Motif scaffolding. Structure first.
Motif, PDB file in Angstrom:
ATOM      1  N   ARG A 147       8.459  -3.885   3.464  1.00  0.00           N
ATOM      2  CA  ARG A 147       7.476  -4.557   2.612  1.00  0.00           C
ATOM      3  C   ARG A 147       7.772  -4.526   1.089  1.00  0.00           C
ATOM      4  O   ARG A 147       7.831  -5.582   0.466  1.00  0.00           O
ATOM      5  CB  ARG A 147       6.052  -4.046   2.902  1.00  0.00           C
ATOM      6  N   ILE A 167       8.861  -7.948  -1.190  1.00  0.00           N
ATOM      7  CA  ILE A 167       8.060  -8.450  -2.300  1.00  0.00           C
ATOM      8  C   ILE A 167       8.887  -8.529  -3.580  1.00  0.00           C
ATOM      9  O   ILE A 167       8.859  -9.540  -4.301  1.00  0.00           O
ATOM     10  CB  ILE A 167       6.784  -7.600  -2.497  1.00  0.00           C
ATOM     11  N   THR A 212      -4.290   3.452  -0.973  1.00  0.00           N
ATOM     12  CA  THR A 212      -3.191   3.474   0.006  1.00  0.00           C
ATOM     13  C   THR A 212      -2.513   4.850  -0.011  1.00  0.00           C
ATOM     14  O   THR A 212      -2.609   5.601  -0.992  1.00  0.00           O
ATOM     15  CB  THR A 212      -2.107   2.367  -0.211  1.00  0.00           C
ATOM     16  N   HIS A 221       1.165   6.811   1.853  1.00  0.00           N
ATOM     17  CA  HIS A 221       2.192   6.925   2.895  1.00  0.00           C
ATOM     18  C   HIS A 221       3.439   7.737   2.518  1.00  0.00           C
ATOM     19  O   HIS A 221       4.408   7.720   3.274  1.00  0.00           O
ATOM     20  CB  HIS A 221       2.620   5.529   3.398  1.00  0.00           C
ATOM     21  N   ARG A 222       3.448   8.446   1.387  1.00  0.00           N
ATOM     22  CA  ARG A 222       4.666   9.210   1.035  1.00  0.00           C
ATOM     23  C   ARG A 222       5.030  10.218   2.132  1.00  0.00           C
ATOM     24  O   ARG A 222       4.175  10.977   2.602  1.00  0.00           O
ATOM     25  CB  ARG A 222       4.546   9.922  -0.323  1.00  0.00           C
ATOM     26  N   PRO A 274      -2.859  -3.344   7.094  1.00  0.00           N
ATOM     27  CA  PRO A 274      -2.064  -3.664   5.904  1.00  0.00           C
ATOM     28  C   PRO A 274      -2.256  -5.132   5.541  1.00  0.00           C
ATOM     29  O   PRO A 274      -2.267  -5.997   6.425  1.00  0.00           O
ATOM     30  CB  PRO A 274      -0.622  -3.390   6.349  1.00  0.00           C
ATOM     31  N   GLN A 275      -2.451  -5.396   4.252  1.00  0.00           N
ATOM     32  CA  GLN A 275      -2.786  -6.730   3.785  1.00  0.00           C
ATOM     33  C   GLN A 275      -1.577  -7.485   3.266  1.00  0.00           C
ATOM     34  O   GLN A 275      -0.730  -6.918   2.573  1.00  0.00           O
ATOM     35  CB  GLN A 275      -3.825  -6.619   2.677  1.00  0.00           C
ATOM     36  N   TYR A 309       0.467  -9.768   0.728  1.00  0.00           N
ATOM     37  CA  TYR A 309       0.472  -9.527  -0.714  1.00  0.00           C
ATOM     38  C   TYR A 309      -0.542 -10.354  -1.507  1.00  0.00           C
ATOM     39  O   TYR A 309      -1.138  -9.854  -2.463  1.00  0.00           O
ATOM     40  CB  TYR A 309       1.886  -9.742  -1.256  1.00  0.00           C
ATOM     41  N   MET A 349      -6.553  -5.664  -5.574  1.00  0.00           N
ATOM     42  CA  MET A 349      -6.241  -4.886  -6.776  1.00  0.00           C
ATOM     43  C   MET A 349      -7.037  -5.411  -7.970  1.00  0.00           C
ATOM     44  O   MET A 349      -7.580  -4.638  -8.760  1.00  0.00           O
ATOM     45  CB  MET A 349      -4.737  -4.914  -7.086  1.00  0.00           C
ATOM     46  N   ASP A 375      -0.318   6.592  -3.611  1.00  0.00           N
ATOM     47  CA  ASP A 375       1.002   7.198  -3.811  1.00  0.00           C
ATOM     48  C   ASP A 375       2.153   6.177  -3.665  1.00  0.00           C
ATOM     49  O   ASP A 375       3.324   6.548  -3.515  1.00  0.00           O
ATOM     50  CB  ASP A 375       1.194   8.442  -2.926  1.00  0.00           C
ATOM     51  N   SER A 376       1.798   4.898  -3.743  1.00  0.00           N
ATOM     52  CA  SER A 376       2.753   3.796  -3.690  1.00  0.00           C
ATOM     53  C   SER A 376       3.546   3.678  -4.984  1.00  0.00           C
ATOM     54  O   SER A 376       2.980   3.791  -6.080  1.00  0.00           O
ATOM     55  CB  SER A 376       1.993   2.487  -3.483  1.00  0.00           C
ATOM     56  N   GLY A 377       4.843   3.400  -4.860  1.00  0.00           N
ATOM     57  CA  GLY A 377       5.678   3.140  -6.023  1.00  0.00           C
ATOM     58  C   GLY A 377       5.330   1.819  -6.684  1.00  0.00           C
ATOM     59  O   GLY A 377       5.093   1.754  -7.896  1.00  0.00           O
ATOM     60  N   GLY A 378       5.282   0.757  -5.895  1.00  0.00           N
ATOM     61  CA  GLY A 378       4.992  -0.554  -6.439  1.00  0.00           C
ATOM     62  C   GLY A 378       3.608  -0.680  -7.046  1.00  0.00           C
ATOM     63  O   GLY A 378       3.443  -1.341  -8.073  1.00  0.00           O
ATOM     64  N   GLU A 388       2.180  -2.173 -10.534  1.00  0.00           N
ATOM     65  CA  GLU A 388       1.249  -3.304 -10.561  1.00  0.00           C
ATOM     66  C   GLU A 388      -0.132  -2.975 -11.127  1.00  0.00           C
ATOM     67  O   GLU A 388      -0.687  -3.752 -11.912  1.00  0.00           O
ATOM     68  CB  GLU A 388       1.073  -3.864  -9.150  1.00  0.00           C
TER      69      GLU A 388
HETATM   70  O1  LIG Z   1      -1.733  -3.386   2.071  1.00  0.00           O
HETATM   71  C1  LIG Z   1      -0.900  -3.537   1.236  1.00  0.00           C
HETATM   72  C2  LIG Z   1      -0.376  -2.387   0.458  1.00  0.00           C
HETATM   73  C3  LIG Z   1       0.673  -2.639  -0.569  1.00  0.00           C
HETATM   74  N1  LIG Z   1       1.132  -3.988  -0.812  1.00  0.00           N
HETATM   75  C4  LIG Z   1       2.212  -4.228  -1.757  1.00  0.00           C
HETATM   76  O2  LIG Z   1       3.248  -3.577  -1.259  1.00  0.00           O
HETATM   77  C5  LIG Z   1       4.125  -3.103  -2.494  1.00  0.00           C
HETATM   78  C6  LIG Z   1       4.319  -1.628  -2.383  1.00  0.00           C
HETATM   79  O3  LIG Z   1       4.852  -1.333  -1.093  1.00  0.00           O
HETATM   80  P1  LIG Z   1       4.529   0.145  -0.441  1.00  0.00           P
HETATM   81  O4  LIG Z   1       3.328   0.761  -1.111  1.00  0.00           O
HETATM   82  O5  LIG Z   1       4.416  -0.011   1.040  1.00  0.00           O
HETATM   83  O6  LIG Z   1       5.860   1.094  -0.668  1.00  0.00           O
HETATM   84  P2  LIG Z   1       6.527   1.724  -2.043  1.00  0.00           P
HETATM   85  O7  LIG Z   1       6.336   0.799  -3.225  1.00  0.00           O
HETATM   86  O8  LIG Z   1       5.858   3.065  -2.243  1.00  0.00           O
HETATM   87  O9  LIG Z   1       7.974   1.863  -1.624  1.00  0.00           O
HETATM   88  C7  LIG Z   1       3.414  -3.471  -3.608  1.00  0.00           C
HETATM   89  O10 LIG Z   1       3.961  -4.773  -4.089  1.00  0.00           O
HETATM   90  C8  LIG Z   1       1.971  -3.615  -3.175  1.00  0.00           C
HETATM   91  O11 LIG Z   1       1.184  -4.474  -3.916  1.00  0.00           O
HETATM   92  C9  LIG Z   1       0.634  -5.118  -0.034  1.00  0.00           C
HETATM   93  O12 LIG Z   1       1.033  -6.206  -0.227  1.00  0.00           O
HETATM   94  N2  LIG Z   1      -0.387  -4.865   0.979  1.00  0.00           N
END
Ligand SMILES: O=c1ccn([C@@H]2O[C@H](COP(=O)(O)OP(=O)(O)O)[C@@H](O)[C@H]2O)c(=O)[nH]1
Ligand SMILES: CC(=O)N[C@H]1[C@@H](OP(=O)(O)OP(=O)(O)OC[C@H]2O[C@@H](n3ccc(=O)[nH]c3=O)[C@H](O)[C@@H]2O)O[C@H](CO)[C@@H](O)[C@@H]1O
Ligand code: NA
Length: 379
Positions: free
Chosen positions: A12, A16, A213, A215-216, A272-273, A275, A282, A291-294, A298
């Motif tokens: 995912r 994106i 969210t 998932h770490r 999971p939604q 984008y 958001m 704990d998401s990086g992206g 954002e």
């Molecule tokens: O239900 C969700 C949760 C996250 N995101 C997007 O997924 C990206 C982050 O991916 P994720 O959190 O899975 O992993 P990480 O960035 O921690 O590797 C970002 O662009 C979020 O906006 C999404 O579209 N739907």
């Protein structure tokens, strides 16, 4: 289309972030741009491919339920060779810090195939946090021939590691490109915006919403359990607020989230939604717990306070600007920080400030230039 460029990604967040770059390269008539997905993810990858209308040229078909790090690594190494052999690319572009990034990079390195790393140089300084993402990006950066750094700090990390200055291009982060594209989709089409909003009929326009969210991998088990208990405590304290939590499909978090949080009236566990919908959420949120990086990139760009449920991060800018605070998985700290944002409108205004060190949303064009020149809650 003499120059052959192969873009490879599996999950995912990579999809994106790579989508705008895929679009930019495919558009050109002087590039033969091809896409291989490893399918490390399936549904969560497909949601991105469908939204951005990307039909991969190759799909390694790897995901299995409950897969291990070794499974993904070996799966890619075995299957990617046939792709490299078929296309004979001039360059392979990989993204970020997943096991896809690592295994594709190793495979290419082993064949003297030049690698460009999109989102290069992020560092936590801890090989065990995030695990294994810190290792993944360090390996990828060591073997890459181009490094597209999202910030000056990431650039500085690379230079300090002995990467040649000519290899590093500070391009900003393509996540801004993607975010802007989707924000525009919503702003330019009222019918679309209405449809997206109607996917969440449980939302009350008069209630403040918190978006969550988690998932770490290093947080699986006890830290995640504590995070869930913090959410319960918050939900009980703020029965008038709505806590919206799009689950992750990793069973190590999906199953305990359902077991622990499923009985709370104002916690909405959803799938999971895609984008487009997630950007809508958001933008609607009062604040974010993640704990998401992206999302760490954002959220602050959208002016939303972010409580980061990690003990460390590789995105220091938002922390320094104040728009994000580290809360780890200490329940007392999570509850205290979230409560302040509910209870104090002055604290909220002090914290809810747009922060974007990642560039103007044209990172993809800069990368190209360098290379060429209803939802029902789960209960
Ligand atoms: O239900 C969700 C949760 C996250 N995101 C997007 O997924 C990206 C982050 O991916 P994720 O959190 O899975 O992993 P990480 O960035 O921690 O590797 C970002 O662009 C979020 O906006 C999404 O579209 N739907
Ligand atoms: C080591 C690694 O690369 N981890 C990445 C992976 O973590 P993530 O936690 O998703 O780990 P995996 O990619 O190994 O997937 C694990 C398991 O989740 C389930 N699953 C996952 C996706 C899906 O679309 N359907 C499904 O069922 C499967 O049971 C799968 O075997 O993706 C995250 C984005 O979300 C990234 O932040 C992580 O860096
Ligand atoms: Na093209």
């Amino acid at each position: 289309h003499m120059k052959k460029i192969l873009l490879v990604f599996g999950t995912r967040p990579e999809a994106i972030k790579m989508a705008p770059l895929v679009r930019a390269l495919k558009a050109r008539a002087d590039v033969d741009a091809k896409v291989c997905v490893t399918a490390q993810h399936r549904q969560m990858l497909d949601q991105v491919l469908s939204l951005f209308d990307i039909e991969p040229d190759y799909d390694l078909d790897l995901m299995r339920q409950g897969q291990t790090l070794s499974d993904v690594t070996t799966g890619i190494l075995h299957a990617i060779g046939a792709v490299f052999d078929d296309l004979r690319p001039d360059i392979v572009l990989v993204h970020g810090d997943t096991t896809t990034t690592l295994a594709v990079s190793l495979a290419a390195f082993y064949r003297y195939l030049p690698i460009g790393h999109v989102e290069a140089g992020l560092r936590s300084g801890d090989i065990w946090s995030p695990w294994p993402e810190e290792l993944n990006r360090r390996v990828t950066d060591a073997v890459s021939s181009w490094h597209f750094a999202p910030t000056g700090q990431a650039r500085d990390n690379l230079l300090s590691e002995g990467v040649p200055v000519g290899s590093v291009v500070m391009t900003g982060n393509t996540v801004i490109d993607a975010l802007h594209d989707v924000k525009h989709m919503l702003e330019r089409d009222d019918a679309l915006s209405r449809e997206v909003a109607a996917r969440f009929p449980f939302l009350d326009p008069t209630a403040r919403m918190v978006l969550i969210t988690g998932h770490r991998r290093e947080s699986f088990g006890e830290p995640f359990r504590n995070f869930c208990e913090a959410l319960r405590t918050l939900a009980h304290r703020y029965r008038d607020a709505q806590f919206v939590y799009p689950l992750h499909l990793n069973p190590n978090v999906r199953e305990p989230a359902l077991a622990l949080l499923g009985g709370e009236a104002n916690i909405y566990l959803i799938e999971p939604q895609e984008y487009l919908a997630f950007v809508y959420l958001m933008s609607r949120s009062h604040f974010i717990i993640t704990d998401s990086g992206g999302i760490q990139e954002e959220g602050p760009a959208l002016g939303k306070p972010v409580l980061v449920t990690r003990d460390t991060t590789e995105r220091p800018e938002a922390i320094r600007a104040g728009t994000a605070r580290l809360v780890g998985t200490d329940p007392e700290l999570i509850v205290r920080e979230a409560s302040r944002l509910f209870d104090s409108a002055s604290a909220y205004d002090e914290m809810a400030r747009a922060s974007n060190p990642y560039g103007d949303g044209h990172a993809s064009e800069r990368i190209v230039h360098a290379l060429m020149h209803a939802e029902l809650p789960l209960n």
